[PDB]
Amino acid sequence: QSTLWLLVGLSVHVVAVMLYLLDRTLSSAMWFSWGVLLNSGIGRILGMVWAGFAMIIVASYTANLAAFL
């Protein structure tokens, strides 16, 4: 369970720094990122870049499932 938690923490921190220095919240950004990382719709010059990894990582997880399958 290390990769998920560490990556979500890193994403929360990076989005927090993106918002903070461009807004002068942290918890709201963290919640939005947590939702984004988990394939739901319950939830800007470079944010899309982050979105990128999401897709592939999900595939990777599923891939291992198939490898397990």
Binding site: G41, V49, I57, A59, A63, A66
Partner: protein, 335 residues
């Protein structure tokens, strides 16, 4: 059944083996009587100090069946032509996503989609919104956010098709199997050991003892019996044939035939050529099946932390480069 009379020196014991099998086959091929004596002095009866097993003297014996190897000093006194193993030698990350020049279609399709967007803002005020839609849509369906809908429909069609193709490709990737010769030593490493991984001192062994000081002549017979090595798995070299025999028996052991780093009768004349011809004529057919049947006889993987190192293959490359690019534009456009 198939045993042979057998004595050592008034008691007889059951006695038979592959050596016995070949001996009896040869005798039948030649119809020669015989006596199956046994060792009495030493484990090999070698001429240690000018005193093989039965031929330590000049003509003490009248045969030679010792499975031990064939040497120069042993051979130079009595011819010992024979076939056997010779006991010479002993003990997805980068290709994850895809090939680069395959999804060039995706770049060109991005450009055409942008152009189609250019073809829609005068047909029924949204460029930055359209730009975000395009950019966030370029990826898989998971996204936070009548040609107008038809273009999106075809877009989603080949997007999901590409995703399914990626699923098939990764299914092929994950289906994979898995499991060093330079010299007699461990891949050009020091003569003996850097004193780590000590071993290969069985006290045959004398053959490498006289080699170019045999690991500093640091062999105090630590090995003792070969089976003693059973504990020594991952806490060694020896006659390769017997090593393979033990391997056949789990205990994965260095088994290299190509290495073969270290590579049967009395001196009595009028016996070499006969048996040599007999074997060269008949052996070639029967002998291999005979040995393997009589005696001398994996892609599975479940899971591990290998998944962590595996996804590390496609994690840092994106995260760190994204951080670098983002920070480069963070402290650059702001002035």
């Amino acid at each position: 059944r198939d045993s042979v009379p057998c004595r050592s020196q008034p008691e007889k014991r059951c006695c038979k083996g592959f050596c016995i099998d070949i001996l009896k086959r040869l005798a039948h091929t030649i119809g020669f009587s015989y006596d199956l004596y046994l060792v009495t002095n030493g484990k090999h009866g070698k001429k240690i100090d000018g005193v093989m097993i039965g031929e330590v003297f000049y003509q003490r014996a009248d045969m030679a069946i010792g499975s031990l190897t064939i040497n120069e000093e042993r051979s130079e006194i009595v011819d010992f032509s024979v076939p056997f193993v010779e006991t010479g030698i002993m003990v997805s990350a980068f290709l994850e996503p895809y090939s680069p020049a395959v999804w060039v279609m995706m770049f060109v399709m991005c450009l055409t989609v942008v152009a189609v967007t250019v073809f829609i803002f005068e047909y029924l005020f949204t460029i930055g919104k359209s730009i975000w839609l395009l950019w966030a849509l370029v990826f898989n369906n998971s996204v936070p956010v009548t040609t107008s809908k038809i273009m999106v429909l075809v877009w989603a069609f080949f997007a999901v098709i590409f995703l399914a193709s990626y699923t098939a490709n990764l299914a092929a990737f994950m289906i994979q199997e898995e499991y060093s010769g330079l010299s007699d030593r461990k891949f050009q490493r020091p003569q003996e050991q850097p004193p780590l991984k000590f071993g290969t001192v069985p006290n045959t062994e004398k053959n490498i003892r006289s080699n170019y000081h045999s690991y500093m002549v640091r062999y105090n017979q630590p090995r003792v019996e070969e089976a003693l090595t059973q504990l020594k798995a991952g806490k060694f070299i020896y006659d390769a044939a017997v090593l393979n025999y033990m391997a056949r028996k789990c205990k994965l052991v260095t088994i290299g035939s190509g290495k073969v780093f270290a590579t049967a009768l009395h001196k009595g004349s009028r016996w070499k050529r006969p048996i040599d011809l007999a074997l060269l004529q008949f052996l070639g057919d029967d002998e291999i099946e005979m040995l393997e049947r009589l005696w001398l006889s994996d892609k599975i993987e479940v899971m591990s932390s290998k998944l962590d190192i595996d996804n590390m293959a496609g994690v840092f490359y994106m995260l760190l480069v994204a951080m670098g690019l983002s920070l480069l534009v963070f402290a650059w456009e702001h002035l």
